From a paper:
Dodecahedron-base is a small icosahedral virus-like particle composed of 12 copies of the [name] pentameric Pb protein and is capable of efficient cell entry. Virus-like particles, called dodecahedron-fiber (DF), are generated during the adenovirus serotype 3 ([name]) life cycle in infected cells. These symmetrical, dodecahedral particles are composed of 12 copies of the viral penton complex, which comprises the pentameric penton base (Pb) and the attached trimeric fiber, both of which are essential for viral cell entry. Through careful examination of the crystal structure, it was determined that residues 48–61 of [name] Pb, the Dd building blocks, interlock within the particle through strand-swapping. The strand-swapping considerably increases the contacts between neighboring Pb pentamers which otherwise associates only through three small loop regions.
An orthorhombic crystal form for [name] Dd was obtained in the presence of an N-terminal peptide derived from the Ad2/3 fiber consensus sequence. This crystal form contains one full Dd (i.e. 60 copies of the Pb monomer) in the asymmetric unit and therefore allows improvement of the electron density by 60-fold non-crystallographic averaging. Using strict 60-fold non-crystallographic symmetry, the structure has been refined to 3.8 Å resolution (Rfree = 0.280). Additional electron density, corresponding to the sequence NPVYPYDTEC, was visible in the fiber peptide-binding site of the Pb, confirming that the highly conserved FNPVYPY motif of the fiber mediates the binding as previously described. In addition, the conformation of residues 452 to 467 of the [name] Pb corresponds to that observed for Ad2 Pb when bound to the fiber peptide (pdb entry 1×9t, ). In both [name] Dd crystal forms, the visible electron density for the Pb peptide chain starts at residue Pro48, while a very strong positive electron density (>10 σ and >18 σ, respectively for each crystal form) is consistently present in averaged Fo-Fc maps on the Pb 5-fold axis and coordinated by Glu451 from each subunit. As Ca2+ was present during the crystallization, it is most likely that this density corresponds to a bound calcium ion. Due to methodological limitations it cannot be excluded that non strand-swapped dimers are present in low proportion (<30%) in either crystal form, however the strand swapped form dominates.
Numbering used by the authors:
A (entry chain P), B (entry chain P): 12 to 21
C (entry chain A): 442 to 542
D (entry chain A): 391 to 542
E (entry chain A): 52 to 153
F (entry chain A): 103 to 255
G (entry chain A): 205 to 307, 348 to 390
H (entry chain A): 48 to 102
The structure:
Amino acid sequence: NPVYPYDTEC
Amino acid sequence: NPVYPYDTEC
Amino acid sequence: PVFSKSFYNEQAVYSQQLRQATSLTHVFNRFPENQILIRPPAPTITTVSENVPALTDHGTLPLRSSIRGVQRVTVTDARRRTCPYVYKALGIVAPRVLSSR
Amino acid sequence: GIRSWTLLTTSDVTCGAEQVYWSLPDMMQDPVTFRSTRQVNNYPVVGAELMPVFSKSFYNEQAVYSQQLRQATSLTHVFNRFPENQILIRPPAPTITTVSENVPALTDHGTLPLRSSIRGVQRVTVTDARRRTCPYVYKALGIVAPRVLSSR
Amino acid sequence: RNSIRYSELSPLYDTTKLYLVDNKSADIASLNYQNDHSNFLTTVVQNNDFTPTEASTQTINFDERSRWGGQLKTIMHTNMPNVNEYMFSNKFKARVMVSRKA
Amino acid sequence: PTEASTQTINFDERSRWGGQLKTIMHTNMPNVNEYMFSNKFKARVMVSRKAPEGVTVNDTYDHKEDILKYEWFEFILPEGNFSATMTIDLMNNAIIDNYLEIGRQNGVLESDIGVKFDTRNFRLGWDPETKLIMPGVYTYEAFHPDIVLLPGC
Amino acid sequence: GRQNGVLESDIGVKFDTRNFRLGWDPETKLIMPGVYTYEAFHPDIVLLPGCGVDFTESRLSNLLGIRKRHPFQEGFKIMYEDLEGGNIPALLDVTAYEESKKDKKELKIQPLEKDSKSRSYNVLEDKINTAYRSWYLSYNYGNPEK
Amino acid sequence: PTEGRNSIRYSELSPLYDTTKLYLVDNKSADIASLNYQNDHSNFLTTVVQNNDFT
């Protein structure tokens, strides 16, 4: 678990 | 009556 | 030590449309169409209660000629009581002479 | 619950506006009750005023709208690891931000008795409430104009 | 006119300062179970060889054959929430509609 | 300076005196310095999660809910002077900055972080009858710092 | 620099506010978002080996909110050698992590080596520490009392 | 006119007169280490000042 949902930056 | 018109957020 | 500072709420109502949309909810503003019941316009100028510290000289007062090593100090509020919003209160007092017997 | 166990106050960035005791001591006859010493930590206080550390406040633009140009400009959701778990979302920014900033403080402490003989090298010391050296002290210039009183 | 003296500067006269702190390290624990910062108590005696309590007894002795007073300057800070209840920026009355029929 | 040290400024007498001490001073204090303890702080988080030795199915959603572990921690901040919030998230990072280190590695879910400083009036979007928040959102508004907790922590 | 083979890669002295290491993670021992999360913290001076910065003849120091602790001498210059432990982490490769779904979980130990315009990050061996040393970190994050 | 018999006093008994005692010890705990590298008990030196706030 990297704990940072990737691609969530607008 | 929930008193909050849903889907009104731009 | 409670005064008011004021600022410029950006473009007043334009600060409000990025607040009916950023709040995600029309929590207060249950009715975004009933002209009457619409979350009141934000004012051009917002005001904020903020507290500063207050350094004050009260004057010079007569004191007993004998002070018990443990002085008790008390800040009373208008309707005379303890105000617990009091943070740190340091009083200092320089004695001085007057009169004579 | 806790409305009794504790109390709701305001956000202090200064977080603890502390006082600090000024004490040069090879000059002043030492105020009442202090014992003469040369233990840096006791040093008979000549005067105290609180920290030059106060708080200024501003208007964080459109609060949460300042936050959406901050979850996107930071490039990372560093704090905000979870931009969907209502609970774990980088808390809303407040309408009003507060910043600990320090101003300089010019203060008159009063008039104090001094020894009748001053060694050319006076030592001054600004002590902090729990009595110690505060190294965040920048430049501290004390000046003192002697004056007469009493007589033998 | 025998006189044994030395350093420990003559318990001096003519005016000094009285420090009236509150968070001085020992004051707290011996005396501030009782309450807050609105009222407390403090040893004004700055001698560390004394527990607040015992110090309480001893007297700062301003003298006479001439009484006097003191110039009290004072510092204070507060954290007051604009809408606290204790200042009544919390409550308020008003009457609304509560029933409708025929 | 040294030689000067010896010589004496000589205030005289047959009358003693005192001096009026006015004084100037400046400081550069970082709001979150360690020396003022605007750096440390304690708090306890979840550090372990399992069940007593037999892995899945009948309790495959329920086994996960059977053993929890807590421990006290003194975690610190990077000195500096930060905006009201900034500070918060810094802890609300360094609180996670502990989890990530021990939580993942011991079955602890993000779900059960358990200690989250945060400003907000969860309950604002309330309603009497549902006894819930009608907009499906803890209406994202800043009110005043607050600390949200899970059981035990 | 250009005129003598020095690469932009190896500038070696860069004042800058930022908490390189904020986007850290324990296990990768790198920055999971593939970015020294672009946030202002407080002025800082990043260095490469050998190169340094002396203020002696200047005050800007006081601006950079950085100051000697015995403010009265001159051992005061800052060399790569002083910022111990305060090496920037190195940064993690995002794309390498991504594409990696081969049948697998290894996918990413690969820490970004050089940026797109092919400028090097002087990563080093071990691949978890770029030899870019920054004031802040060393002071705040790494070195007890040494 | 501001002539004075102003007198701020308190406990800390008037540095008193008329005769006291002078304690001339030698093994007082601090004397030793600051001063008794130099020699023995035949000669030494001692703080006669019994104030512990002083080296």
